[PDB]
RNA sequence: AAUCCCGUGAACCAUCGAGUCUUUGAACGCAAGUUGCGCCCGAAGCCAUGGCCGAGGGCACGUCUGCCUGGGCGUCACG
RNA sequence: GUCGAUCCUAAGGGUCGGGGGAACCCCGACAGAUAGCGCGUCGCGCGUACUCCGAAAGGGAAUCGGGUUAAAAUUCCU
RNA sequence: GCGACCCCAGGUCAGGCGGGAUUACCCGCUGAGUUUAAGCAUAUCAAUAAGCGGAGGAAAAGAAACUUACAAGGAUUCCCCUAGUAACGGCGAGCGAACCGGGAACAGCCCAGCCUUAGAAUCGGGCGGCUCCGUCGUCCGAAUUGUAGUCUGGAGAAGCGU
């Protein structure tokens, strides 16, 4: 098993590499990945236990007689439904899809569509976002007024 | 670091077994007890001879009965000390049983008490 | 709506960016062992199709199958019979390396049931394909109304009776009509009923 | 005189191990007997008591288990001696709730346009 | 041979058990019709093949 | 055979739902022209936490789900 | 317990993994995270893919007289 | 060094699944020659016997990428007929279906993909309760590289009102 994954590394970059699949080893830069993830860090959606905790005071609420969330969105095929529909602000695409035909079209995607797109690295760590092992690729709608400047 | 050029599989935990239900409901019966080993003693003449010259009961015991087993079923079931036992299996299929007594017992009287004699 | 345009570059397997993928794939696949689990299928747009559900009970192996025709397995390429019979090389096995692909994980894996299969990638010596099973034991399978159907008895070793997508294929299943009669019910039922001596009470 | 079954149900543990116990060795004198030339009638007596200690342990047996059963009742896993026997193929069948399970519109369809009760006018 | 294994001595031992005449009580049951051991075997004559 | 007869009841009776079911065999600790060669758990009993004794049971392979313990710069992030 | 089998390995046999094979089967430690062992008291050290079968003439822990049965003994008795 | 993920390894870890047997019928593969041709090699015997696998009370097939050319039929299977016919064949020996028509039976359907994003609404396992082939609560997992719903061309989505 280390043989043969030692061996994959070596082979891929022995061989030309297609335009297409070069593109995604020109990841953000690492000063600017930090102030995008801080960001992120700030539009988590809610956890199992947060998910729940306001299913109940909800229906409290009913039985004695609010505001649209401001959440990342994920999900590969979510988010091309956001792209195609041009209400997507910002995708974040995860370098190391496997396998890459997931995302190898998403740049085209949005470069098509006139929506600003990044290639991160870490699809554990957009994973980790959303409270879940890993992630494709997030985006965001849109993002909170307090903040639009900085975005 | 690594000083050896073979990979060498790591040591890893191992749990014993905890199952959650038994595979067997309870424990089986006990098939080999005193009176299954020792099934009948032995009265032919050359066997009755052995209780007076050698100090020796005869006995036809179960095939799957070891020496050690035989021993023990003596000593539950006629409360006696053995000084060895000889076995063997007769051309019939049976285990007969060479069993002498010790000298702090008689097998001629012990005889008597199984009726035989 | 993603899977359209995975789909969609996949019929493009003389691109550049297909034919890397594909290069370095293989490589990797000839280093492996023939029959392989892997953690999830590598066309989840191809797999999910042919029935595959990213839930418990789905499991996808890859299957190396070597290429070729079948060489008739006869000691010294001997035939005893008539020239017509005497061929040795050029024979054609009936079934398709799909359908053996199938058949080897199917064998090696007899608690589990053949869904589906697909091809994967090729070279010269070999070819590749990924099998769907299903643990039919699973409770998250027999309590779906959609896959439960395998549970039953009658599809044991779906594979090796031709009756996956690839059996229904080399049996001739695969269309009607006046090209494709011979195959139904079966082509030996069909010969066995056309033989037939029907001999009537009143004739 | 002779051992009843229904008279050994009520009695308890230990008293079914101690009878069991007197006639094993009652038996064993027996086929003593049987060695030393004993006479006809003792010779009959060795079914009789083989039919008792039989009759013994199946009680002993009987109780042991309906004991279990009841220790193991309303338990999720079970002995396997314990589970239901039937037939290896019906113990993989599919439950009855699961074999009647349907998608949500073969579910509508019933309710909707089920099958109608009607006649033809003579 | 006496070097002989203990499964053979065992096969051996229920031939001998088999190699026996029938009771004769067994002549005046109600609608009898042994009349006498058709299986016995004689060492001599005919072998057991093991 | 004071086994059994106005009856918890005879039977080489019928029937089946309780229960028993040796060694093997797909045969599963390893083997086998061997009742051969291993390891683990352990009621009861018994000698002063330990020791002996021991009924009975366990230890094949492939595989699914979950889990525990790990390996590799395989891809990263932070010191 | 003392004679043998049992133990050891020989020519060879049967196999894991891997490679073949529609499959029955073929090759047989050759495509591989070996088996574990040792010393402390769970930890350190070591660690080259079979703890398998294969000899009643090969290798090999230990029994000798005397006596005893209608029939057994370097096995029973002393 | 500490973490996340990926791939892989070990486990007598918790709970499951698989092997073998049977031959009348059924499904897949493999596959002869005797024989016939008055010889014989294509052919025929035969898409058969033998061989290797896999099921069930039936199996297989099945809701048209069909038949047909008509004033049109309408999933599959089976019987009669088509027919010893069209066709095939050292056009020799021989071989040989199908549609229409008449009957037996009759049944239709489920997914994949654009479409929850104001909420993975889905499922498994551990534990507990209950009215226990299931259901409810709770916890831990699976899953966004997509569970459940909606849709399947006969349609359908959306809007409108009967
Ligand atoms: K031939
Ligand atoms: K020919
Ligand atoms: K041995
Ligand atoms: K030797
Ligand atoms: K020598
Ligand atoms: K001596
Ligand atoms: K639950
Ligand atoms: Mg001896
Ligand atoms: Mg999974
Ligand atoms: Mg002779
Ligand atoms: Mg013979
Ligand atoms: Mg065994
Ligand atoms: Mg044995
Ligand atoms: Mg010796
Ligand atoms: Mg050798
Ligand atoms: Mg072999
Ligand atoms: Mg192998
Ligand atoms: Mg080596
Ligand atoms: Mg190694
Ligand atoms: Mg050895
Ligand atoms: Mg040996
Ligand atoms: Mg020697
Ligand atoms: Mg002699
Ligand atoms: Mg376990
Ligand atoms: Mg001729
Ligand atoms: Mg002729
Ligand atoms: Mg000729
Ligand atoms: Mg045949
Ligand atoms: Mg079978
Ligand atoms: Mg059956
Ligand atoms: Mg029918
Ligand atoms: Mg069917
Ligand atoms: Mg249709
Ligand atoms: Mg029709
Ligand atoms: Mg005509
Ligand atoms: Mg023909
Ligand atoms: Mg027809
Ligand atoms: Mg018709
Ligand atoms: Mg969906
Ligand atoms: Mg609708
Ligand atoms: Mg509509």
Redesign the pocket.
């Known amino acids: 098993?280390?043989t043969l994954?030692?061996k994959k590394?070596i082979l891929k970059m022995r061989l030309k590499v297609p335009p297409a699949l070069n593109q995604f080893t020109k990841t953000l830069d690492?000063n600017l990945a930090?102030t995008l993830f801080k960001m992120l860090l700030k539009y988590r959606?809610?956890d199992?236990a947060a998910?729940?905790e306001?299913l109940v005071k909800r229906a409290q609420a009913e039985a004695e007689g609010?505001?649209?969330?401001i959440?990342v969105?994920?999900?590969?095929?979510?988010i091309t439904?956001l792209i195609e529909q041009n209400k997507a602000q910002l995708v974040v695409i995860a370098?190391?899809?496997?396998?890459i035909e997931?995302v190898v079209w998403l740049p085209a995607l949005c470069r098509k569509m006139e929506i600003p797109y990044c290639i991160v690295?870490?699809?554990?760590?957009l994973?980790?976002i959303?409270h879940?092992?890993?992630?494709?690729?997030l985006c965001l709608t849109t993002v909170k007024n307090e903040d639009k400047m900085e975005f | 670091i690594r000083?050896?050029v073979?990979?060498?599989?790591?040591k890893?935990?191992?749990?014993?077994?905890?199952?959650?239900?038994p595979?067997?409901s309870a424990?089986?019966?006990?098939?080999?007890d005193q009176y299954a080993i020792l099934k009948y003693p032995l009265t032919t003449?050359?066997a009755m001879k052995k209780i007076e010259d050698?100090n020796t009961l005869v006995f036809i015991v179960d095939?799957?009965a070891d020496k050690?087993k035989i021993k023990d079923a003596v000593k539950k079931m006629y409360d006696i000390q053995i000084k060895?036992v000889?076995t063997l299996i007769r051309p019939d299929g049976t285990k007969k049983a060479y069993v002498?007594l010790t000298p702090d017992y008689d097998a001629l009287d012990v005889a008597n008490k199984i009726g035989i004699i | 709506?993603?899977?359209?345009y995975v789909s969609e570059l996949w019929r493009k397997k003389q691109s550049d960016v297909m034919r890397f993928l594909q290069r370095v794939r293989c490589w990797e696949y000839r280093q492996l062992?023939?029959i392989?689990?892997?953690?999830?299928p590598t066309r989840?747009?191809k797999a999910?199709?042919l029935?595959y559900?990213?839930?418990?009970?789905y499991?996808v192996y890859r299957v190396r199958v070597?290429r070729g025709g079948?060489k008739?397995?006869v000691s010294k390429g001997i035939?005893?019979?008539?020239?017509?019979?005497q061929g040795v090389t050029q024979?054609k096995?009936?079934?398709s390396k799909r359908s053996?692909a199938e058949?080897?994980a199917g064998?090696?894996?007899?608690?589990?049931k053949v869904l589906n299969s697909y091809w994967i990638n090729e070279d010269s010596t070999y070819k590749y394909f990924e099998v769907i099973l299903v643990?039919?034991?699973?409770?998250?399978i027999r309590?779906?109304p959609?896959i439960n159907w395998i549970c039953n008895?009658?599809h044991?070793?779906r594979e090796?009776?031709?009756?996956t997508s690839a059996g229904?294929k080399?049996?001739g299943?695969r269309?009607?009509?006046?090209?494709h009669?011979?195959a139904?019910?079966?082509?030996?039922?069909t010969?066995?009923?056309?033989?037939?001596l029907?001999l009537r009470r009143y004739r | 005189?002779?051992i009843?079954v229904?008279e050994l149900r009520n009695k308890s543990k230990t008293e079914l191990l101690a009878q069991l116990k007197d006639l094993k060795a009652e038996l064993a004198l027996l086929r003593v007997a049987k060695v030393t030339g004993g006479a006809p009638?003792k010779l009959?007596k060795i079914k009789v008591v083989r039919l008792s200690i039989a009759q013994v342990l199946?009680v002993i047996?009987?109780k042991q288990?309906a004991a279990l059963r009841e220790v193991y009742k309303?338990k999720?896993?079970l002995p396997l001696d314990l589970r239901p026997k039937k037939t290896r193929?019906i113990?993989?069948r599919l439950?009855?709730?699961?074999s009647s399970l349907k998608?949500?519109?073969?579910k509508?369809?019933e309710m909707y346009f089920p099958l109608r009760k009607y006649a033809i006018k003579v | 041979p006496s070097?002989?294994?203990?499964?053979i001595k065992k096969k051996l031992a229920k031939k001998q058990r088999q190699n026996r005449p029938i009771p004769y009580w067994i002549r005046m049951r109600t609608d009898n019709t042994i009349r006498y051991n058709a299986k016995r075997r004689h060492w001599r004559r005919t072998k057991l093949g093991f």
């Open positions: 098993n280390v994954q030692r590394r690492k930090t959606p809610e199992k998910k729940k306001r609010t505001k649209k969330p959440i969105k994920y999900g590969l095929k979510h439904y370098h190391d899809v496997d396998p997931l690295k870490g699809k554990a760590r994973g980790s959303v879940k092992k890993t992630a494709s690729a | 000083t050896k073979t990979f060498h599989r790591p890893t935990l191992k749990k014993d077994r905890s199952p959650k239900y595979r067997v424990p089986g019966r006990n098939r080999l003449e050359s050698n095939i799957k050690k060895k000889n002498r | 709506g993603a899977y359209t062992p023939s392989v689990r892997v953690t999830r989840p747009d999910r199709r029935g559900k990213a839930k418990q009970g499991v070597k079948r008739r397995p035939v005893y019979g008539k020239p017509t019979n024979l096995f009936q079934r053996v058949e080897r064998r090696k894996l007899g608690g589990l643990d039919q034991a699973h409770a998250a309590n779906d959609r008895p009658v044991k070793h090796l009776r031709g009756l229904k080399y049996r299943l269309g009607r009509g006046h090209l009669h011979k139904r019910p079966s082509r030996r039922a010969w066995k009923r056309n033989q037939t029907s | 005189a002779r009843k229904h009638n009959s199946t047996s009987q288990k309303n999720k896993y193929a113990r993989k439950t009855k709730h699961q998608t949500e519109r073969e509508k369809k | 070097h002989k294994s203990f499964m």
